[model samples]
Each structure stands twice: as C-alpha cells, then as structure tokens.
Target: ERPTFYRQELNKTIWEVPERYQNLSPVGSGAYGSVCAAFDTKTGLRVAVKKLSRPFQSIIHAKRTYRELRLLKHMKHENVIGLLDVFTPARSLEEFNDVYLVTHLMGADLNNIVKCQKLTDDHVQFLIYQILRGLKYIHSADIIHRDLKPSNLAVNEDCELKILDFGLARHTGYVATRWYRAPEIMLNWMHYNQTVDIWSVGCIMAELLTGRTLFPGTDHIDQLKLILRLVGTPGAELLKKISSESARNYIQSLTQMPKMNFANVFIGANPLAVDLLEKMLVLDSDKRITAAQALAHAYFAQYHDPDDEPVADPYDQSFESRDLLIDEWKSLTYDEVISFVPPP
Candidate 1:
C-alpha cells in the first residue's frame, strides 16, 4: 500500500528506509541499526532512514519509539531532528518487525563534530544550550530522555546540537548506560522520574568541556564509583530508597572520592558558560536546575535572547509568512498518530 504524504512543516522530506536505500549503500551502521541516504524515486527527495537490527519489540523500546514520534509529530523547534514520517509506521511492537524511521539528516552527530580537537568553550556552550532547550520540551511533556550521550545527539549545519537515539530512552527506564546512569539507578533506585536525564546532561556538559567522558567506567561498579567521585556519595536514606541491599553494599564498598566541580574542572573556561554548566550539573535531583533556568542563564544572552526580548532593532527585522495547508500531517489527530502497519 502507498503510504500517506504530507508537506513538511520545515519544508523537509522523509525518505523510505532500507528499501529506499536499495539503490545506495548505507552511510553507517551501529549495533541497533543502520543508516543510509535514501533517494526517493517518486519525488527525488533525499532523506536518511534508520532501521533497527531488531524490530521495536520490547515494551520500553516501543514506548520510546512512540514517545519520540509523538514529540516530533507535535513539537515544532529548530534544535531537533525533524521527523517527516515513519518510513514504515507501525504502532504495535509486534508489527514493527521491519520498521524504519525517516528523519532529516541535518548534519553529523556530536561525535563527528568533536572528532576535531580545535575545541572552544564558546562552542561547548552552544552545544549545551541547544541540548537543554530540547530537554525542556521533553520534560514539559512529562517525558524523560534516559539516553543523552554524544552519540545519541546530533549536530546541524548551523552547529545546533539536538537530542536523538530514543530507542533506549524512556520517560521511565530502570537502567541507563552504565556511564550515564545516575546513582539512584545504580543502587536499584526504582522510584524515579526525569532526574535520570539531568544526570546525563551533567555527563555531557563535563565531556564537552573536558574532551573526555564524565563518568568513564568499565563496568556497572565502576560506573557507580565514577558518579560518586563527581557528585559525592548520596546519603544513606537516598541510597537505600533506590538501591537493593546488595547494590547498596556494592556502592558502599567503593566509597566516595572527590572529583573536580565545573569551576575546578574548567578553570580557564568561559566564566558564564562554566557558571551555567554548574547549574546544569547540580546533583540533588529535586534541586537540579530546571531546563527553563538553564535557558534563561546569562551565558546564552550573547546569541539568542535570554530575556525573551524582541528583535534588537527594527533594522534587524525579518518576516516569514506561508500558506499552511491541511494535509496528512494535519489529518493526524491526538489519537491517530502511529498507523498500526508498516509504511509502503
């Protein structure tokens, strides 16, 4: 069957998947999937298609797939990888056995950008700013992006950093990547929410500043140890709430070690950027600075208007107007997002 079509809000195109790449080899592949540049024979639009090695089968993975799709479907923002359509949309996990996601391949991921060492604090500042903006939206939706590492992030041609790779992400996931996983999860912390995401942002901020992984650990134990070193160990009550007795025993054995905070870590870093970095990495999950605060931080006043101010002057004026049409995209209702079956 022919899949439905809609005009891209951002004037973007969504290509079909592995099938779309039948005429071209994949640009890259990872454990969960493969990405390839697809040239749509019908319209000749170029798009990137990512296919999961395993169809979205698990409950958590399926939830993330839909959560991300819902976010992309409803949200309109610049710092995100826009979803044009599901290469082969399917709502049910069992039905996604051959699913592929279609999104605009704006630019390479952050991993590609940082591959070059000519790093600047300013550059790092901009990346963190965009990431928090994306997170703000995710959190606003009451969703949590559990996976927020460099590889799970993408950069645009304009150097905008975006959050991606929601396959393992969730509003509620019991586990996180060993390195990005928070103390609560390490100690088997069962009752938690978006705080896990804050932990990840802290990790990314550190990596961006230091050109290193914030929680560089080899195994589960090392990962927990790494976190305690940076944030100081959690209190007994906090530890017990999240961890099982055995898990708590493991963390207790490691002991807390002092690690550098942003000030000491990035001494020569831009003062404003580092200040905001400190806000982003706050450890008390409840008191962890919110994304709204991060956005209003003084650091980004240089580029985007931090005060929600209007254009600096009329001379710097810009106008944008377009005739919006009601199409497949508009045809989507709150309940009819995922099309139960694969796309054509």
Candidate 2:
C-alpha cells in the first residue's frame, strides 16, 4: 500500500502525516503532546513525529504553539534537536488546529538510560560536555530553556546527546520540573535570566553522576528546603533580591543550614566535577557559573573547544510580544508549516 499520505488515530488523536513517514508507533506522551517513532522511506532514516495536544485550546495554548514552532525553526545546532518537517491535516485556517512536528529519532531519553545502565566517568564527562556545548549555543541566542531535565535530554548508543522540548523556552525571564528548578525561581524572584538554565544543568549533571535525583522534594516549600539543605542557606544580602516578602521571611526563619560536601554525596566523583557542580548550584544566581564559563572549566578540558563552541545569532522574538487571537495564530502557524522543506 503506497499511499501519498498516512492517516491514523493514535492515543485519541488523529495524525495525518505525509506518506514518507511510516511504521508509526507511540513513544511518549505528556501535557504538551504525544510523540511517535516512524521510518522515513524517503530519507531511509527513523524520525519522531510530535502532535501538539490542544494546540489552540486557548489563547495561551495557541501562543505557546506558535512560539515553539517559530523557535524550533530558528534553532540549528548539533546538540539541539532539529525540526525536520511540520504538517497539519487541516486545509484552511479554520481547520488548521492540529500541528505536527518531525525531528531526527534517538534511542532513548537520559532518564531511562540513567535508570538502567551504569555510566562511566568518561560517559558522564562527555554527556555533560555536550549539554554545556548545546546550552552555550542556546544561551548565546538570548533564549532560556526554562525546562531542562533528564527526560528532556535525548541520548543515542554512540553517546551523542541532544536537547529537546522547547515548549517552555523563552527569550528571557522564565516549572520547569520542581526538582530541576533554580532557587531564584522557587523564591519567586522579581526578575531572572538565562542562569536559571545553568541551575538545571547542575541538577542534571548530579543525577548523571550518581544515578539519583539531586533534590527530589515533595512540594514547593520542601523543594526550596531540599536545595537549601545542600547549598546552605542564602545570606540576608541575597535574600533582598527576592520579590515576595513572605519568601524572604521564610528563608530567614529557617535555621542556618551548613553546605553539604559534594564529594560525600557523589562518592568517588572527580574533584573537578564536584568543583563545577558547586559553581553551578550557587544559591545566589549572580554567583552561578555560565554555560560558556563552565565549558572552560578544568573538568571539560578533554572536550572543550573554544573555536568549536558556536553561538547562534540572537533569536528574533518580536512576534512573541504580540497578543494574537486563535485565528491569527492559526494563519501564522499554517504559513510556517507550508514553508518547511524536508532533506533531499
């Protein structure tokens, strides 16, 4: 059966994708969308197809859909997942509610791999290096991946890693998973910047090294306490930056928590690795190390390449500020879908 297109209703959602993408099978699902693995007959490679769930469910949903599409189109990096194709079954703006995105397929997410397999120090080093390499590019473009966690990172058998899921990414100022969230975010700071992502990277690196979540808290309050337990309590000077008076008072009320030794937590880990973690997980956001700076750290000396670590042109986010209705979002998304060209 050589049809020009493939249509199937999977996971209570209808997928009408080009025929070149075949053997579709569900891989993962979440609040944002459902993803499936398929073989691309045209390119003789496997690919992942994601269908945005309720893309136009509301003004907020519609805008997020548009933002993710635009940002994905703008980003092109080796360690960042690339947008291969975008399509919709809809023929007109009214029917153009569903948005499907295609990208290169990988073996499994870091969460699954870390749970099952035991990674060597070399594996940890290279994986973290690739993550920082990717973040260097992403940060350079003036964007912050508000959500960075183990599951969001995809890895292959060859140990290559790529960052995915831009649903929560913004040009600046952004859960992010609670466990991976930065302290400033938990404290509800008035303004935050790209360093939020570096905090997440630190959490992820700790998980990769120890095969355990660094700060798995039960709730928001506990999340902050869990972090303070390890990083130690913040100083009164740093507390002033917090916007919420209650949050500041809450921190002050708590007994002083002496910092835990990373070497004790991550037993047998390289001292250099511990040093980088301390730099990244600073309670004060201003003191936290940057992606570019971390890349230059002694830990990544084996793989660090100043010339090779490329930065992207700052992302153009002028359209993001506009508050568009569903109809307007639909038209712009449809135009973007039609403009995409698959690899030859």
Candidate 3:
C-alpha cells in the first residue's frame, strides 16, 4: 500500500504534541498554511493549531515565519490573539522540517460577523475601540499592523475581539491590501508609519456601520481613482511626495476632488463617530490621527477612562528588508521557535 503526500508530511515533518490532544477538524487554509481545531484534554480547552506550509521552501517563507514568531513572542495583550504553544517532532535542525503553533480558538472572524449579523452603534464603537487598543500596544512596540482588514480581526458572541495574522504585519506597503489600504501606501510611500493603520481602521469602521466596502478598487490605478473620488485629492505637496512621477503626473492631470461629507456617508450615525472616522480617513499620513489619539476621540469618551488607557513606551525598533542566506534562515527559524516561551 502506498501512502499519500499529506500523510508523508503529517507523519514525518510534524510537531510532537502531547498524546492527549485530539484533532477536531480543519479550521481553514491560507497561503501561509492550514489551521485545525483541536481539543486539549489536559486543559479541557479547544485550540487552533496552524502548521506553516512549506516554511523552508524559500527564504520568503522562512523570514515570514521568523518575523511572525519574533513579534508574537513579545506581544501580551487582551485584544491580540495569544500564542499558546509551539513544538516540532524533529530533534535537530538538520532533521527539523515542520513547525506548529497553538492558539485560542475564536468563535468567528469579524468579516463573517459583519456579513451575517446586524451591527449596532455600540458594536461598531466597541469593535473599533478594541482595534485601536490593540494597535495602541502594537504601535507602542514600534510595530505597525499593515493589514487591518475585517478578516484579520477575530471576534466572539461575547463581542470579545482580537487581532491576528502578523505574517503581513509590519512596523509599518505596496504590501498593504487594496480596500483597507492607506493613501500614503497606495501612493507608493514607504515612509508611512502608524497613521496607515488608522486609515484601515476608518475603512473597517465604515464597513461595520454601512455594511459594505468603503473603497472597493479593482486594480492599482483603479484603487487610486476610488480613493481620489471618495476621499478627494490631497495637496500638490502631498502629491509631490509620491515616489512615482507617473502617479504624481496623473494626479496633477485630474480635477481636484472635494472631500465627501461624513454625515451623508455614514447616514444617521453619531456625529462624534463620524467625526473620528473622518479624521482617520485623511489622505495625508501626517494629518491622520494616531491609535492613541483615536482612542481619546469624543466618540469613545463615554467608554474611555484615563486609568484604562494603554501606556505607550514608544521605542524605535524598525525592521528593514534584508536578504538572508539559507543557512542564516535555518538558524533564525530554530532560534525563533526554541526561544519562544508561550504566554501563561
């Protein structure tokens, strides 16, 4: 009898878990890998186990795995998804081939919740509030969650929300996704900072309130066009800062567009909520509100408490794109996995 490809990978390149864990079902699959729901007999808890697909296949996969584990190891927040355990069946790096991480199983992602359920103002406020709170900690660590789409946010019936997927995360994008992308990123601005995340928050908040995408662009140019029509064009000074001369010229050729009214867009939403949303969607990264600033907005004043506000250390730890040799990546992968002590 011949075994299958999945069986070969599962039996040979696998993590050594306690025998008590019972595999429940496959949760989902993505470019990074597949996740499955499992039951831990020791803790009587359900967990999500993600095994990186082809982690060592290329330098890109190895680096992404390293970056994710490095950041996740240091993050301890109520709103950020918690890493529970990590292990590998292989004893040596030479034999080491697979890695698996365990995390708390969420009820569903925010994307599904917003699609099937009707959200109220309270839901919108609290959801965005948690996003800002998580970003507060993330930014304070000098990290930027470059991808802040609804799908990346996890939620439960209790309204408990947590941010996930640090693979695309940055201290930061051409890297950022289209719909939730910030103007600075869409314009090919690499120097964009925390404000980019704020712009995404605005896009998400609008989606939750309106039950539709804010800027559903088709392509790169179409994305720019959508942004221009919806958010309006920024000043020439901002345009001049764009990295691409062609993009700058194209903007110059187009008619200047006026900013859209938030009242008309959000439609019957609270003035304060609309106000904060407007601030977040600003075209200029410099003018856009920070996560900390957004948390203190009038929209959240009712729920805000100074005692509960996150204290930011504000350090400078930025990651630059670096080329790593295969040997270097192997060391990084092993070190990242071995040194990581899952949060208790």
The model with the greatest TM-score is 2
Q: Candidate 3: deviation at residue 117, Å?
A: 3.3
lDDT of each: 0.58, 0.84, 0.75
TM-score of each: 0.70, 0.93, 0.87
Question: Which stretch of 10 consecutive residues in model 1 shows the poorest summed lDDT?
Answer: 311-320
- Candidates in descending TM-score order: 2, 3, 1
Candidate 3 ranges with C-alpha deviation above 4 Å: 1-18, 166-176, 311-323
Which 10 successive residues of model 2 have the least lDDT summed? 167-176
Question: Residues 61-115, candidate 1, lDDT per residue (tens digit)?
Answer: 4443444455555544456566655654444433434445666665666767877
For residues 163-271, what per-residue lDDT tens digits would candidate 3 score against the true structure?
A: 8873522222122367898867776654778889999999999888888788888777788788878788878768767767766677788888887887887889989
Error in Å for residue 135 of model 2: 0.7
Give the winner by TM-score: 2 or 3: 2
Error of 3 at 7 (Å): 7.0
Task: Note the residue pairs that clash in candidate 3.
Answer: 144-171
Off by over 4 Å in 2: 1-3, 166-176
Off by over 4 Å in 1: 1-23, 27-32, 40-45, 53-72, 89-97, 166-176, 236-246, 259-261, 304-344
